[PDB]
mmCIF file of C-alpha atoms in Angstrom:
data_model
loop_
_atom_site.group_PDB
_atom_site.id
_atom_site.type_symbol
_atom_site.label_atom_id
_atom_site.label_comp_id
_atom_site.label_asym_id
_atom_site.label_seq_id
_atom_site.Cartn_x
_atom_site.Cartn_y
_atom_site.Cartn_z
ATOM 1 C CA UNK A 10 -6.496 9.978 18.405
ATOM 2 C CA UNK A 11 -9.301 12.697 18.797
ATOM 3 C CA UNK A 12 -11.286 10.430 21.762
ATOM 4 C CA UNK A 13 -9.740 8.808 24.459
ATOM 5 C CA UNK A 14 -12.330 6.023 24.149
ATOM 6 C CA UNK A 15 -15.802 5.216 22.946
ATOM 7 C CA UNK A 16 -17.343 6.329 25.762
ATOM 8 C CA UNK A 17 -15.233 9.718 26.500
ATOM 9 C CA UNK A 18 -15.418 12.603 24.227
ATOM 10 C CA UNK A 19 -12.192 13.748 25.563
ATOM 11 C CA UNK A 20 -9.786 12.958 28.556
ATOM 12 C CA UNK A 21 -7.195 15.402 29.900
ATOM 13 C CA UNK A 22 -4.649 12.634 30.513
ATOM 14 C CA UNK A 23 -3.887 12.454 26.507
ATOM 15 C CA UNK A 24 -1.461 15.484 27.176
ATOM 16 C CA UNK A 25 1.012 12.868 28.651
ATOM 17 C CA UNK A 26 0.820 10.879 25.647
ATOM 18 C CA UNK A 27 1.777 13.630 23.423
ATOM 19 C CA UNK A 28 4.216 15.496 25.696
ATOM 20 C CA UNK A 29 7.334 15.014 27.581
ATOM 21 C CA UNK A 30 7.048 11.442 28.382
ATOM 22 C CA UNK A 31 6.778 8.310 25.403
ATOM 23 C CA UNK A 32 6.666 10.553 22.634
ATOM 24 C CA UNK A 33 3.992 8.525 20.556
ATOM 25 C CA UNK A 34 2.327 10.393 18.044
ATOM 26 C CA UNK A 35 2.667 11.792 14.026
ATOM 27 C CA UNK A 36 0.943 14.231 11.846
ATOM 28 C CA UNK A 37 1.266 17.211 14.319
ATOM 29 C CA UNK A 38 -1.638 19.110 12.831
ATOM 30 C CA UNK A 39 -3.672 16.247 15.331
ATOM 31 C CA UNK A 40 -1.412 17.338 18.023
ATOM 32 C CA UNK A 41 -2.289 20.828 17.612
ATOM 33 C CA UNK A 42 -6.168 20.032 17.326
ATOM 34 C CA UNK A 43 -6.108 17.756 20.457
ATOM 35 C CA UNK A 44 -4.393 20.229 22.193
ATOM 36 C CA UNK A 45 -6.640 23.084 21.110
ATOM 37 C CA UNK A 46 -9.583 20.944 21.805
ATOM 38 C CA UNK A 47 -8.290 19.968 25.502
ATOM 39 C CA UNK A 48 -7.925 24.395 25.916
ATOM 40 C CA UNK A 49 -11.390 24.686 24.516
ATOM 41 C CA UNK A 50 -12.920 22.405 26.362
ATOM 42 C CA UNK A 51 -11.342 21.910 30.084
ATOM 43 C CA UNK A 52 -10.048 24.579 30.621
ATOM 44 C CA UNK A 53 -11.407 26.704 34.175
ATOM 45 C CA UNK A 54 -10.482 29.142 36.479
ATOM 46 C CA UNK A 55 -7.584 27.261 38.833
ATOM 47 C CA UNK A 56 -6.823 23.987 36.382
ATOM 48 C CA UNK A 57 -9.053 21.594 34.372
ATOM 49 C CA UNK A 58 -11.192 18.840 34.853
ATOM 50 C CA UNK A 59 -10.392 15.242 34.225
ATOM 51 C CA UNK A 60 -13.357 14.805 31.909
ATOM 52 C CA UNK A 61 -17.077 15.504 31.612
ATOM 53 C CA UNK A 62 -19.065 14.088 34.420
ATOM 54 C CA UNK A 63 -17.602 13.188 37.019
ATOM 55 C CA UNK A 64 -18.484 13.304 40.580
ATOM 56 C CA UNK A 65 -15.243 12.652 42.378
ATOM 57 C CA UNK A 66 -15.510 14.935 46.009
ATOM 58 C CA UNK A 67 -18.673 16.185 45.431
ATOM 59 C CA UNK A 68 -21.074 17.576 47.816
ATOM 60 C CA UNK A 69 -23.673 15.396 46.522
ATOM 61 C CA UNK A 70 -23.508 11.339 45.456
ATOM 62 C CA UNK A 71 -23.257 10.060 48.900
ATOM 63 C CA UNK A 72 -19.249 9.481 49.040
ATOM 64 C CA UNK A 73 -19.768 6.723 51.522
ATOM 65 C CA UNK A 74 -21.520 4.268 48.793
ATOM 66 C CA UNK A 75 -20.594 3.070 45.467
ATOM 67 C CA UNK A 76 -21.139 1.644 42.526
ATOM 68 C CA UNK A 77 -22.930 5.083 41.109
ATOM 69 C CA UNK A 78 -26.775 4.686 40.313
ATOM 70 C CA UNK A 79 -27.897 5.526 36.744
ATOM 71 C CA UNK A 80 -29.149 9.151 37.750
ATOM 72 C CA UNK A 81 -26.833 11.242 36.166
ATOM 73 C CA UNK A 82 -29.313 13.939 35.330
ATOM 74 C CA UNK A 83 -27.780 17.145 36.057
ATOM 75 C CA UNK A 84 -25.954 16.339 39.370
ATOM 76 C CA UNK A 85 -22.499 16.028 38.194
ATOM 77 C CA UNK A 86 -22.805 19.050 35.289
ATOM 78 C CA UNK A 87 -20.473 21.506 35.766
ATOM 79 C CA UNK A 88 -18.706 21.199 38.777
ATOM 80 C CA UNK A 89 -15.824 19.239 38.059
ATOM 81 C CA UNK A 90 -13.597 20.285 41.045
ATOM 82 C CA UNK A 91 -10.284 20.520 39.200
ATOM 83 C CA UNK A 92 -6.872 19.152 39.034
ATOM 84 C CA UNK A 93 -3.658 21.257 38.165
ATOM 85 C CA UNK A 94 -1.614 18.267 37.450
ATOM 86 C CA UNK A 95 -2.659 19.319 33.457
ATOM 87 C CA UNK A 96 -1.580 22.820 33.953
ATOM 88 C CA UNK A 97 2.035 21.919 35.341
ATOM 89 C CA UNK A 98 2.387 19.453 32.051
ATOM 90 C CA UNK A 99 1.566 22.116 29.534
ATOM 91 C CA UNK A 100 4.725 24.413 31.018
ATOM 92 C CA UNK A 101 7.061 21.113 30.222
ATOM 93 C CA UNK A 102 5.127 20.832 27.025
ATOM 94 C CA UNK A 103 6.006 23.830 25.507
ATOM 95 C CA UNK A 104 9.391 24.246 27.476
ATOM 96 C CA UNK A 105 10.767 20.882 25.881
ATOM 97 C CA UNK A 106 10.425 21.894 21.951
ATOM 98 C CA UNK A 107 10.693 25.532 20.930
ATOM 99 C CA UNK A 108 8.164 27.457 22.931
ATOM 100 C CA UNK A 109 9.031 30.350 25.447
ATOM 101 C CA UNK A 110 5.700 32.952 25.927
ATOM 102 C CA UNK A 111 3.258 29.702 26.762
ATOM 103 C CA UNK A 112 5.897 28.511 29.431
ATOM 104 C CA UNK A 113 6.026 32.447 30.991
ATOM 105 C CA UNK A 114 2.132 32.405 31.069
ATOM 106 C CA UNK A 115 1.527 29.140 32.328
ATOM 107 C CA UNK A 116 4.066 29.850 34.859
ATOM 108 C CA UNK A 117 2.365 32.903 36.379
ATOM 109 C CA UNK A 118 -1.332 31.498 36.116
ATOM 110 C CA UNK A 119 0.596 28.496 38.282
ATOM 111 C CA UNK A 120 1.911 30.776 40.510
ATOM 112 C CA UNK A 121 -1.241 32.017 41.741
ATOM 113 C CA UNK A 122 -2.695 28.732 42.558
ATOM 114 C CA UNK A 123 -0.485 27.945 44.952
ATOM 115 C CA UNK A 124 -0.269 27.292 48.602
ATOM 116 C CA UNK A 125 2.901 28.162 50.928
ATOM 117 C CA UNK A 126 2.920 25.268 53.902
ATOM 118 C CA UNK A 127 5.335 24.932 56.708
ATOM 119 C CA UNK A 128 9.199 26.438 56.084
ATOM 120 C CA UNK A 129 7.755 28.835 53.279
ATOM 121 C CA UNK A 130 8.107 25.956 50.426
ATOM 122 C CA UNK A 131 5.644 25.271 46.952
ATOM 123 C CA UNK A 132 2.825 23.370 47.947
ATOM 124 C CA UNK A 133 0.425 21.729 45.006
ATOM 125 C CA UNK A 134 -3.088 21.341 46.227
ATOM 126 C CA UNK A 135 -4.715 17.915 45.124
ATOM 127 C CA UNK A 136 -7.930 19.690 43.781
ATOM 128 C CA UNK A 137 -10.497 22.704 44.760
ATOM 129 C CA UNK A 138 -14.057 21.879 45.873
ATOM 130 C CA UNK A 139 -17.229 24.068 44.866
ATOM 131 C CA UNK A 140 -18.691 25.451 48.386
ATOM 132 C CA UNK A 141 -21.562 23.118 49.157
ATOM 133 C CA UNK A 142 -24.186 26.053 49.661
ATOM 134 C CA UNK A 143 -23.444 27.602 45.955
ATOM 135 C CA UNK A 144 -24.163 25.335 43.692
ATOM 136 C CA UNK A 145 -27.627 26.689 41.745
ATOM 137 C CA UNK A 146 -25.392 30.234 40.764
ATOM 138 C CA UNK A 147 -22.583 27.863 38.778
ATOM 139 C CA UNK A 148 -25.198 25.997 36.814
ATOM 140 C CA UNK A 149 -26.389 29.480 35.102
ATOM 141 C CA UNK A 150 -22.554 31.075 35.872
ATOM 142 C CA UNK A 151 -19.983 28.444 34.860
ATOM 143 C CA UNK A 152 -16.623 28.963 36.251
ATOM 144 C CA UNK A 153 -17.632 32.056 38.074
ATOM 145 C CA UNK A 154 -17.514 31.010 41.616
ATOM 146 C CA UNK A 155 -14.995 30.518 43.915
ATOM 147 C CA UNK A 156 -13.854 26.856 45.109
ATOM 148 C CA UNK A 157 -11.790 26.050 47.984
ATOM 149 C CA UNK A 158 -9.268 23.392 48.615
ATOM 150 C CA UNK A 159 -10.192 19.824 49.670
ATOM 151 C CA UNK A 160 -8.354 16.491 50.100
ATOM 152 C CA UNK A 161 -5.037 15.186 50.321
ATOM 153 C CA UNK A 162 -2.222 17.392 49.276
ATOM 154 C CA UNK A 163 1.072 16.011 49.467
ATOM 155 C CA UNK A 164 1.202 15.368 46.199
ATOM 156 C CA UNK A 165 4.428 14.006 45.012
ATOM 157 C CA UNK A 166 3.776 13.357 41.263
ATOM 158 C CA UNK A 167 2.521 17.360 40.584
ATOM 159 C CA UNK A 168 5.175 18.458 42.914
ATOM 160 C CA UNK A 169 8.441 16.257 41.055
ATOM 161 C CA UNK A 170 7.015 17.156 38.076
ATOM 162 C CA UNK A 171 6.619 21.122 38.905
ATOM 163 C CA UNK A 172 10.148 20.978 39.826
ATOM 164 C CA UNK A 173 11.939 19.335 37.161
ATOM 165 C CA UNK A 174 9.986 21.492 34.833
ATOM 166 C CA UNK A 175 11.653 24.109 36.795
ATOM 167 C CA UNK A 176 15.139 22.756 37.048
ATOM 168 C CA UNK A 177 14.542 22.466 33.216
ATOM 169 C CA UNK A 178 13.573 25.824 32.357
ATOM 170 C CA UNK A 179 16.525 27.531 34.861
ATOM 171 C CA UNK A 180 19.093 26.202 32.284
ATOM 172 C CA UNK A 181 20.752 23.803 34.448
ATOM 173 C CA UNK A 182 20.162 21.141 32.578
ATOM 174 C CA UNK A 183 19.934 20.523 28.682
ATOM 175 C CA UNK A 184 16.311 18.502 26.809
ATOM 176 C CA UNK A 185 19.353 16.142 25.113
ATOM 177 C CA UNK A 186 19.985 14.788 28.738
ATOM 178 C CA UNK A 187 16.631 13.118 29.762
ATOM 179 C CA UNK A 188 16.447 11.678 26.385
ATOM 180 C CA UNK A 189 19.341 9.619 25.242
ATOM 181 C CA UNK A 190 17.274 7.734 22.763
ATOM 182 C CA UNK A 191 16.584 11.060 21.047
ATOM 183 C CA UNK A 192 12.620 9.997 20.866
ATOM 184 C CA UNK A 193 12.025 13.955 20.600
ATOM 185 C CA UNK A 194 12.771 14.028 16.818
ATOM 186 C CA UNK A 195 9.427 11.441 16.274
ATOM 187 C CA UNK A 196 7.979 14.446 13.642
ATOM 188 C CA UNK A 197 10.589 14.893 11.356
ATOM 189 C CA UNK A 198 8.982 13.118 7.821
ATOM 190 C CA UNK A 199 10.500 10.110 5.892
ATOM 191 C CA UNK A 200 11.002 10.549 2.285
ATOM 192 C CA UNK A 201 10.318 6.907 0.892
ATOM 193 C CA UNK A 202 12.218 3.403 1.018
ATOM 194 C CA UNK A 203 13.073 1.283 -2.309
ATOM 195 C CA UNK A 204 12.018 -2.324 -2.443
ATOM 196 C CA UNK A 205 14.122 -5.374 -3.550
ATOM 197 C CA UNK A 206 11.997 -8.356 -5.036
ATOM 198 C CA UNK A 207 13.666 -11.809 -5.819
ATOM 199 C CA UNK A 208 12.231 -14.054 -7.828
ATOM 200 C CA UNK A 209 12.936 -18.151 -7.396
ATOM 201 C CA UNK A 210 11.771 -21.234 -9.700
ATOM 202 C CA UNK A 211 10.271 -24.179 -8.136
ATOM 203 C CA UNK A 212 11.801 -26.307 -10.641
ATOM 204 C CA UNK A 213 13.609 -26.648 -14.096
ATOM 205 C CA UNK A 214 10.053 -26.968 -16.198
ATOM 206 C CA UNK A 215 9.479 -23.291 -14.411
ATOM 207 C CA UNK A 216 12.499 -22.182 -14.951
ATOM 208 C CA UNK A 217 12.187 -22.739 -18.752
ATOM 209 C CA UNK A 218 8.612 -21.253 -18.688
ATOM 210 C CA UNK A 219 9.945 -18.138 -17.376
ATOM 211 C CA UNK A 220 12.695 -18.196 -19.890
ATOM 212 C CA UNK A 221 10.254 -18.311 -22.724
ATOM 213 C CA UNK A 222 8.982 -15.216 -22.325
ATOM 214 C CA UNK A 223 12.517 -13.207 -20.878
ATOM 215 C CA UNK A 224 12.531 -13.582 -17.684
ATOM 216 C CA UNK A 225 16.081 -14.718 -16.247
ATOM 217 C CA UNK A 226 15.523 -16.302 -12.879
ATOM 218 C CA UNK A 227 17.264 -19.034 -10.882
ATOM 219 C CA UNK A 228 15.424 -22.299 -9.629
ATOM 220 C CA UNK A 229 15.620 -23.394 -5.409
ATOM 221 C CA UNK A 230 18.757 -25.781 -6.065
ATOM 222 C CA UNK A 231 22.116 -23.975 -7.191
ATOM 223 C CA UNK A 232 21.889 -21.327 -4.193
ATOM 224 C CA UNK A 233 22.955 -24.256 -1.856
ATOM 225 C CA UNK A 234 24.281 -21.648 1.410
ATOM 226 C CA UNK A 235 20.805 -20.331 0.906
ATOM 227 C CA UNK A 236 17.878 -21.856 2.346
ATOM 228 C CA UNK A 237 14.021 -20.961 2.596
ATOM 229 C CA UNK A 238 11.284 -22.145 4.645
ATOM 230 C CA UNK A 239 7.672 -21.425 4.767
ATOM 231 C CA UNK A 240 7.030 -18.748 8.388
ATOM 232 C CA UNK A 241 5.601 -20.827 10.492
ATOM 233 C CA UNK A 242 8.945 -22.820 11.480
ATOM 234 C CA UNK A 243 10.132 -18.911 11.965
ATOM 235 C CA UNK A 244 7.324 -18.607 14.450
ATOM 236 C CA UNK A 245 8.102 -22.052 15.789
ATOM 237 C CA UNK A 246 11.634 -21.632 16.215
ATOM 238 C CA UNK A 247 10.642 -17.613 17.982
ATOM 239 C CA UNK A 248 8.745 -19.646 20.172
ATOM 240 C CA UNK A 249 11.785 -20.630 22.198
ATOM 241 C CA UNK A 250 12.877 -17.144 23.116
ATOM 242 C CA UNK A 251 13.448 -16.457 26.736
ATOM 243 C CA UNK A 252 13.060 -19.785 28.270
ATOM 244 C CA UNK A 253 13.367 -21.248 31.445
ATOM 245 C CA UNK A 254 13.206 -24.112 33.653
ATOM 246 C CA UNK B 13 63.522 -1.392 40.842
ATOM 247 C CA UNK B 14 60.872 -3.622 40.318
ATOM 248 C CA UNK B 15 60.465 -7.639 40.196
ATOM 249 C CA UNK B 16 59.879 -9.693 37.103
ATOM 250 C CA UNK B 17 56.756 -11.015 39.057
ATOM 251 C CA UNK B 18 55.512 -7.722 40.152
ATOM 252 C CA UNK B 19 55.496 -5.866 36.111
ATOM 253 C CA UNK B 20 52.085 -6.620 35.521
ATOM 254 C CA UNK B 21 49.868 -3.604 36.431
ATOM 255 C CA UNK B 22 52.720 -0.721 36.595
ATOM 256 C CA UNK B 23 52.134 2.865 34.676
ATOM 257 C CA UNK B 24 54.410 4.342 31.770
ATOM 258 C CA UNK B 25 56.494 1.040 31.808
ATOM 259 C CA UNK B 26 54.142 -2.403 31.195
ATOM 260 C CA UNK B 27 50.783 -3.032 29.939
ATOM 261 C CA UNK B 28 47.910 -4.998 31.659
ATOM 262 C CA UNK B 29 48.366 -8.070 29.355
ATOM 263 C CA UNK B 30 52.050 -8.979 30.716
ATOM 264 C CA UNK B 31 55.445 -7.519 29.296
ATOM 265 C CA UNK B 32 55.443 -10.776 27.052
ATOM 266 C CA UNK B 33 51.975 -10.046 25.315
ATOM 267 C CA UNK B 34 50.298 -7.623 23.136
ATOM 268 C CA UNK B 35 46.549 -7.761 22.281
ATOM 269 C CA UNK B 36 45.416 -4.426 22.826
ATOM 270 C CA UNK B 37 41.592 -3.367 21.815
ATOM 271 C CA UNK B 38 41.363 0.276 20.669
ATOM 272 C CA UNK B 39 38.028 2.025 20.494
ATOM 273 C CA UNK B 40 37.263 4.077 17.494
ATOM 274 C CA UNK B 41 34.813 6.893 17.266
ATOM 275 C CA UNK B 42 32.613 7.283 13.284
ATOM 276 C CA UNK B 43 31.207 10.978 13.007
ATOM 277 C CA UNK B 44 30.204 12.215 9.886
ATOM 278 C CA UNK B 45 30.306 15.473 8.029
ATOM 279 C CA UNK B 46 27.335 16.661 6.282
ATOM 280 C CA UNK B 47 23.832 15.303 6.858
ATOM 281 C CA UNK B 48 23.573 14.394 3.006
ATOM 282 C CA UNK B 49 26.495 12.343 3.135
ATOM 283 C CA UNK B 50 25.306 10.760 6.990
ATOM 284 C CA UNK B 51 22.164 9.829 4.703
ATOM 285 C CA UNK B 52 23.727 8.455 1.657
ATOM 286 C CA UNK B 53 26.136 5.974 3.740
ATOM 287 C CA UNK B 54 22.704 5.112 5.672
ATOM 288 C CA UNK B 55 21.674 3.795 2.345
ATOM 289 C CA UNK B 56 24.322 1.086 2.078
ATOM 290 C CA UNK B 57 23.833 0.403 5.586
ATOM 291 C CA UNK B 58 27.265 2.823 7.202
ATOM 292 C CA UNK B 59 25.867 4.016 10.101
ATOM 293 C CA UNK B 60 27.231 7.469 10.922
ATOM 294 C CA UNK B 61 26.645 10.331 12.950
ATOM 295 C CA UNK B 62 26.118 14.456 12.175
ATOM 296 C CA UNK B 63 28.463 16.254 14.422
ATOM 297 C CA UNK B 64 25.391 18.610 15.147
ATOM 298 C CA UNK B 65 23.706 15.631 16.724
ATOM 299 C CA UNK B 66 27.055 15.477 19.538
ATOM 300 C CA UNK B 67 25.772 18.593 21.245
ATOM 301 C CA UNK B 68 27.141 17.590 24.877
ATOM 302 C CA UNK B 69 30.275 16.885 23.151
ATOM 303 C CA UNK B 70 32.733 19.316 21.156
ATOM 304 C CA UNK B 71 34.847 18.255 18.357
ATOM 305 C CA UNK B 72 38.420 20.681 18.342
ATOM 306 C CA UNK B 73 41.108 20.976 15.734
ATOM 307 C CA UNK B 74 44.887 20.384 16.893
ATOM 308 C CA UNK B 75 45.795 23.950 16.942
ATOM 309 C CA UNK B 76 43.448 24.330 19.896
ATOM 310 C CA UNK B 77 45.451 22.467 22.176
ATOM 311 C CA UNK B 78 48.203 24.007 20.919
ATOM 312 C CA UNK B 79 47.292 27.255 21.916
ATOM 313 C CA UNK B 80 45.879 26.061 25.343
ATOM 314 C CA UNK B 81 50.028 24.399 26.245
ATOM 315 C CA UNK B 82 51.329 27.654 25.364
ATOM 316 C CA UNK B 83 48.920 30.067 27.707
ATOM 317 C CA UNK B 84 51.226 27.633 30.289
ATOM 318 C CA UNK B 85 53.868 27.985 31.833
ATOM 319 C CA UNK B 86 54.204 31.909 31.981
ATOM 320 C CA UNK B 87 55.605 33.702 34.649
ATOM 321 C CA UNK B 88 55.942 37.928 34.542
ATOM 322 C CA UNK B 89 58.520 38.375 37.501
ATOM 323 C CA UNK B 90 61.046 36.130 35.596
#
């Protein structure tokens, strides 16, 4: 749970995992250190960074070629563009459950980031690039200087997602609604289950033995509309599920 | 006035089936009560369902309706 893999320290798409959509997670008190971790951590100035290291529309690494060369000194340190795609899931995060303050706060520093396009409508920028000429300043001033916007931005999965956090937080619609399956009830605890045991003789001599020493059990024969058979005609007879010619 | 061929699909007066058949399937609707009753008939396998778990839906006594037919029908002139 704390890594996304053995090679990432931490990735900002494990907020998906363990927000509005497949609810698939226990123990909350890792849900609140993941998600104090991701704040700590990736947090900037206009969004967050995908994870340490990377180079994606960078002024340097020669975008034209591939396949990146193993000298990752220091030119891919601390200019992670950004991408506000993790800022527009944390107002649906704490929207969905109980929480009110986070979504007004994450709502203005959204506001600010944004661009008005054609017809006066919400635009969500793709990502903002570090000017190419100051770039020595932000290695010994971390998120201190300005970026501007670069690439693509008609992006529809920020945009659908901005707005039906919005349609959800204007009332219109109820959290019971987009769940039917009721997955957001995944932390409430399970007290304990009781477990039933049968016991079976192989044959009368075993039967007897157990007797002996007071133990009332009943051999394989005499429960006749009962029948049992070792798993692996189970797995063979599973094995026939969903067939066809 | 209304054939003996034609009484198959007519309101207030036949059913679906035919006029000389009756199997009608009725659905029923299981709510429960209290949550520590819903839990107990869990344990012997009754499924139920907490009526704070219906939140879309509203459950109403009969006096309700009651009250709502009699608001109708009122005119002040007469």
């Amino acid at each position: 749970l704390p890594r996304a893999s053995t090679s990432k320290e931490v990735d900002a798409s494990l907020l998906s995992v363990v927000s509005f959509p497949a609810f698939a997670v226990e123990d909350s008190q890792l849900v609140e250190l993941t998600k104090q971790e991701i704040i700590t951590k990736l947090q900037g100035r206009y969004g967050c960074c995908r994870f340490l290291r990377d180079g994606y529309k960078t002024p340097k690494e020669d975008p034209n070629r591939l396949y990146y060369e193993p000298a990752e000194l220091k030119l891919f340190e601390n200019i992670e563009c950004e991408w506000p795609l993790f800022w527009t899931y944390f107002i649906l995060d704490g929207v969905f459950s109980g929480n009110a303050e986070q979504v007004q706060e994450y709502k203005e520093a959204l506001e600010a980031v944004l661009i008005k396009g054609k017809n006066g409508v919400p635009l969500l920028p793709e990502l903002y690039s570090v000017p190419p000429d100051r770039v020595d300043e932000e290695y010994q001033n971390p998120h201190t200087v300005d970026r501007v916007p670069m690439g693509k931005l008609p992006h529809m999965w920020g945009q659908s997602l901005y707005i039906l956090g919005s349609l959800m937080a204007e009332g219109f619609l109820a959290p019971g609604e987009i769940d039917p399956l009721n997955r957001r009830f995944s932390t409430v605890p399970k007290p304990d289950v009781v477990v039933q045991v049968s016991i079976l003789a192989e044959t009368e001599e075993i039967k007897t033995i157990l007797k002996d020493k007071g133990i009332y059990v009943e051999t394989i024969a005499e429960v006749y509309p009962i029948r049992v058979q070792p798993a692996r005609i189970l797995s063979h007879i599973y094995s026939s599920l969903g067939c066809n010619n | 006035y209304v054939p003996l061929k034609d009484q198959r699909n007519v309101s207030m007066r036949f059913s679906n089936q035919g006029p000389l058949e009756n199997d009608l399937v009725v659905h029923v609707a299981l709510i429960a009560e209290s949550q520590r009753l819903q839990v107990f008939l869990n344990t012997y396998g009754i499924q139920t369902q907490t009526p704070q778990q219906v939140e879309p839906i509203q459950i109403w006594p009969q006096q309700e309706l009651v009250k709502a037919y009699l608001q109708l029908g009122i005119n002040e002139k007469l």
